[PDB]
Design an enzyme around this catalytic site. Structure first.
Site, short mmCIF file in Angstrom:
data_model
loop_
_atom_site.label_atom_id
_atom_site.label_comp_id
_atom_site.label_asym_id
_atom_site.label_seq_id
_atom_site.Cartn_x
_atom_site.Cartn_y
_atom_site.Cartn_z
N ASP A 162 0.84 -1.22 0.00
CA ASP A 162 0.00 0.00 0.00
C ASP A 162 0.87 1.26 0.00
O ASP A 162 2.10 1.16 0.13
CB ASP A 162 -0.93 -0.01 1.20
CG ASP A 162 -1.97 -1.11 1.10
OD1 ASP A 162 -2.34 -1.46 -0.04
OD2 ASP A 162 -2.41 -1.60 2.16
N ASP A 199 1.03 3.26 2.29
CA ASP A 199 1.45 3.53 3.68
C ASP A 199 2.93 3.19 3.83
O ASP A 199 3.55 2.68 2.87
CB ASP A 199 0.62 2.73 4.68
CG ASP A 199 0.68 1.23 4.45
OD1 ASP A 199 1.31 0.81 3.46
OD2 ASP A 199 0.10 0.49 5.26
N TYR A 220 -15.61 -10.31 26.17
CA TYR A 220 -15.90 -11.00 27.45
C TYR A 220 -15.82 -10.00 28.61
O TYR A 220 -16.64 -10.08 29.54
CB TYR A 220 -14.90 -12.13 27.69
CG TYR A 220 -15.09 -13.34 26.81
CD1 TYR A 220 -16.28 -13.55 26.14
CD2 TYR A 220 -14.09 -14.29 26.69
CE1 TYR A 220 -16.47 -14.67 25.34
CE2 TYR A 220 -14.26 -15.41 25.89
CZ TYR A 220 -15.45 -15.60 25.22
OH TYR A 220 -15.63 -16.71 24.43
#
EC number: 5.6.2.2
Lengths: 664, 83, 264, 53
Positions: free
Chosen positions: A13, A15, A277
DNA sequence: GAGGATGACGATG
DNA sequence: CGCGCATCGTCATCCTC
DNA sequence: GAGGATGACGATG
């Protein structure tokens, strides 16, 4: 020809993350096959980062500096519909067809000329060139600072079509951006001591109130939605979990509340459950640490035309000295141990007085271990052992970085049985561990106890821990990195930076109270005029009403004036004089308003009378009261964690004094 | 009534105001009545008659309200007329 | 720690009752008897029976099958096949109610929306099933649905490889459609009585749409005792049929139709 | 081998099949049935009309 | 020329 | 953070002695 | 008795 392939094309990418992968691949190839770097063996595939569209007209941009130059060179702003391309999920097959329709634009090869480039290839991959990388980062930071000060635009690649790509520019232009980004995101600054991930999480938490509890996985999406987070979801949840950990040896003051199993002090502390959780809730200390009135002090960034979090914050205490800054980046690192929170207030008071502050010692919450400093920037930490009988022995307190499973596997197993070279030292051991405390019913031969004493209890059982603090490098308020020497100098620098803001807060508060004061005064004057009676309410036009309001010395909205003087610092507005219900016409409302208008006058006179000093102590008084309340809650939790068992027995205990090897 | 003028606003106690509102045939909040008759289906409430800003005292607001009150009457008559 | 007890071979028949491919009608009668008993008990207001009231050493298989597994069968049947009034499953119902709770003028992420749905709708079935239901609601390609409640933003699976090759729920985005405002008018909120769980106003048991959804998107439910499989039809003919029924004439027979399908 | 060649120029929604076949075998395929040989027929029955009232 | 065997399936573990 | 086994029941093919 | 080798580590791929 013998090889199964002739060309290797890698695609990443826009990036900076792909730069590391490309560098690692070049290292893997050149480390054993340098000669293959001249036969068209490697090539590169690129992708777009952003696209503009208006009236079926699209333009490709592959660089952020290219986009900045396009904005600076084209008179159309907001005219073009912009679309960002952060990841791969955004692109579709219809776009991939156009991407593969033009190979000469994206499929770009490389070029190698001269062995000097290999030195650069080794520069980012040599364990003996640390200072060279330090000078390289320093030169880049100085160049960036000079370019930003002079306002000259920087250079970028992929401006026009290219056939090859030199390695020297490849290393000096693309990987350096990844190095700078990793360094900016890895180590926090010295002003607030908060990393960008913690900063985004805390800003998102400040955005809402969160009176009740909230899920971690649900909060992560809300943080990513507003903070422009583009680093997956696992890292953000891990950062939230690290912020949630508050057990002994991890942190001293958290910003959340422990709800659920956030990992125990037995097995690595990383045995927590799924983020869905567990639940979480904001703490009550954050309200006093970051007062809301400080929102008008710092200037926020402007990304996507959205109000986002600032670059730093202004806490009441340096967080690095209360939770530790453990950052590992390129060129430098940071490792600062914890300290005592009570001494910080006394030190700040002594500094406000003007006296030399006393030297501090690294402290930890719920830790009775003594620490002696022989050499500067070096510390020795030992635990406590209890000798009940000539045969039985129990370890009362364990030093920092001591996990039950690791200590057991590394100490009890060699000592229990006879190893290849050492006879069995211990004869029996028991592990009656509680949630926080430890118990060791350990038996030992009385004859061997004398040898253990002659050698040293801390030495045989490996209870001593040595640590050195030398990497005192933090991001300054400007943005530079300076290696520091002592903590007191950091405290003095923070004190000066904080003193700079008392006048700013006072100027922001001054006049702002006067604005509502004059507004209430005008409202009371209007009420008194109505009691006397001159303004006819018999279906009079608004134009005559505004003319009367102007002719009778009534100003416009002061809140509008303060709002106008915020971005860079019809006609008149009188909506607030007509948006008032009839309740103001009652006797009780008038009587209470007559004193409500003076309640603000009292604070305004006090501000005009008080000095910029004597405010820090008044602010700390409430914080100390809240801290005592939080400690009382911690004692109540300890009472909850009290099973009903008997107290630890008093026994002989000693601390070894290691000879000083004069290290460094 | 305010245009004609009988209710003095010179710091009168709320008790006298409520007594006048009761003596002059003014009902309580109908929205409160519909809310009460929803779960299973002090004294009077007159907050909505005092929570109104001064903009109602203007000519344009009165003129637009005179037809806004009939905009609902038109739909009410249509509902009473439609099947 | 409670053990079990076995007495008589008759219990084995019950052990086979829920596991025999030749006793489908027997299971049908069993579910019918249980539903009739529950209806009678609810009408008479008598409280039902439960286990684990006091300490027990053993547990008979007959009561074990007739009391505990039957609850799972009833719950699976209630959650698997939608009703005839609105034709929406409980998961779709919770998602649509949560969507109605907000306005959603702009787009929103699927993974972010799933947490908000689970927070208010009291969802206790993990997160993967809810995201899968959202993806099924998002699919609108030829041969899948005829009228969706969302807008296609991203790769929701193509018509080439199974249609289940979509990306992560966070990779894709979603947005509420404009048809839902007319399908479920807000003024209908005062018609149905909502349930009271955790002292919280929650979604109703069903809804009142303008058209039967089963005839526009299909109801493919597989449950215990029975199932449901209804193909799609044409949306234009539904309005004509409803008008003819409002007139009082015998409606014409319909034919299964699909959007973008020229097959006879 | 029934077919001799086939191509798949599939679009996002529509399909394309450049398929070649022996002219002699086409007569047998016609006598047997195009839908039958290529398996284009689909039968479905709707009997489980059970819904919650 | 019919009956056992193979997958289509949609929410959940 | 992509990888993978099943359930309840109903039904379309489908193939061989 | 000292220098190369082995893990501790915290955000991200």
């Amino acid at each position: 020809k013998t090889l199964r392939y002739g060309k290797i094309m890698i695609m990443t990418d826009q990036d900076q993350d792909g730069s590391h992968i490309k560098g690692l691949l070049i290292n893997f190839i050149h480390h054993n096959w340098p000669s293959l770097l001249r036969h068209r063996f490697l090539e590169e595939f690129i992708t777009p980062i952003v696209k503009v569209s208006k009236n079926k007209q699209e333009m490709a941009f592959y660089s952020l500096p290219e986009f900045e130059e396009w904005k600076s060179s084209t008179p159309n702003h907001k005219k073009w519909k912009v679309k960002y391309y952060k990841g791969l999920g955004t692109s579709t097959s219809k776009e991939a067809k156009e991407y593969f329709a033009d190979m000469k634009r994206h499929r770009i090869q490389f070029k190698y000329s001269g062995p000097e480039d290999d030195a650069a290839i080794s520069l980012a991959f040599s364990k003996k060139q640390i200072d060279d990388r330090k000078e390289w980062l320093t030169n880049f930071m100085e160049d960036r600072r000079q370019r930003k000060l002079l306002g000259l635009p920087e250079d970028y690649l992929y401006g026009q079509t290219t056939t090859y790509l030199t390695y020297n520019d490849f290393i000096n232009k693309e990987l350096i951006l990844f190095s700078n980004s990793d360094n900016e995101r890895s180590i926090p600054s010295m002003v607030d001591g908060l990393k960008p991930g913690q900063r985004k999480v805390l800003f998102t938490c400040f955005k809402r109130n969160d009176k009740r509890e909230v899920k971690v996985a649900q909060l992560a999406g809300s943080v990513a939605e507003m903070s422009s987070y583009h680093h997956g979801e696992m890292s953000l949840m891990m950062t939230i979990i690290n912020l949630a950990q508050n057990f002994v040896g991890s942190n001293n003051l958290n910003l959340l509340q422990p709800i659920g199993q956030f990992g125990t002090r037995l097995h690595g502390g990383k045995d927590s459950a799924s983020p869905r959780y567990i639940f979480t809730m904001l703490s009550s200390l954050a309200r006093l640490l970051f007062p809301p009135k400080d929102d008008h002090t710092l200037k926020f960034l402007y990304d996507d035309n959205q109000r986002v979090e600032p670059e730093w914050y202004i806490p009441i205490i340096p967080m690095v000295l209360i939770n530790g800054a453990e950052g590992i980046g390129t060129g430098w690192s940071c490792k600062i141990p914890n300290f005592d929170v009570r001494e910080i207030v006394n030190n700040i008071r002594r500094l406000m007085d003007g006296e030399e502050p006393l030297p501090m010692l690294p402290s930890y919450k719920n830790f009775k271990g003594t620490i002696e400093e022989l050499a500067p920037n070096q510390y020795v930490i030992s635990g406590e052992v209890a000798i009940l009988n000539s045969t039985t022995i129990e370890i009362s307190e364990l030093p920092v970085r001591t996990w039950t499973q690791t200590y057991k596997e590394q100490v009890l197993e060699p000592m229990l049985n006879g190893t290849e070279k050492t006879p069995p030292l211990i004869t029996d051991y028991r592990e009656y561990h509680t949630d926080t405390t430890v118990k060791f019913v350990v038996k030992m031969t009385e004859e061997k106890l004398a040898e253990a004493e002659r050698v040293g209890l801390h030495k045989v059982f490996k209870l001593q821990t040595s640590l050195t603090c030398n990497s005192m490098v933090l991001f300054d308020h400007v943005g530079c990195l300076k290696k520091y020497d002592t903590v007191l100098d950091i405290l003095r620098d923070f004190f000066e930076l904080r003193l700079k803001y008392y006048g700013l807060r006072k100027e922001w508060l001054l006049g702002m109270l006067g604005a509502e004061s004059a507004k209430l005064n005008n409202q009371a004057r209007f009420i008194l005029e109505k009691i006397d009676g001159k303004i006819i309410i018999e279906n009079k036009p608004k134009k005559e009403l505004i003319k009367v309001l102007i002719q009778r010395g009534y100003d416009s909205d002061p809140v509008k004036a303060w709002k106008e003087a915020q971005q860079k610092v019809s006609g008149p507005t009188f909506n607030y004089l007509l948006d008032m219900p009839l309740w103001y016409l009652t006797k009780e409302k008038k009587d209470e308003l007559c004193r409500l208008r003076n309640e603000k006058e009292q604070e305004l006179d006090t501000l005009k009378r008080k000095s910029p000093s004597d405010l820090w102590k008044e602010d700390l008084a409430t914080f100390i009261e809240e801290l005592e309340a939080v400690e009382a809650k911690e004692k109540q939790d300890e009472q909850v964690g009290l099973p009903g068992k008997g107290g630890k027995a008093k026994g002989k205990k000693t601390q070894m004094a290691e000879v000083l090897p004069s290290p460094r």
